[PDB]
Amino acid sequence: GVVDILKGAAKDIAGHLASKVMNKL
C-alpha cells in the first residue's frame, strides 16, 4: 500500500497548508 501511503501522506502536509488560506476567511 506504498502508493496508497504516499498520496495519503501528502494530505498530512497540505493539512497545515490548506489551513493558512482557510485561516484568512
Side-chain angles (χ1 to χ4, degrees):
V2 267
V3 179
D4 195 60
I5 296 166
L6 272 155
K7 224 87 93 80
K11 205 191 193 188
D12 183 271
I13 306 173
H16 59 83
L17 214 305
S19 102
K20 252 70 189 172
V21 195
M22 201 76 150
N23 248 308
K24 207 85 173 166
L25 41 140

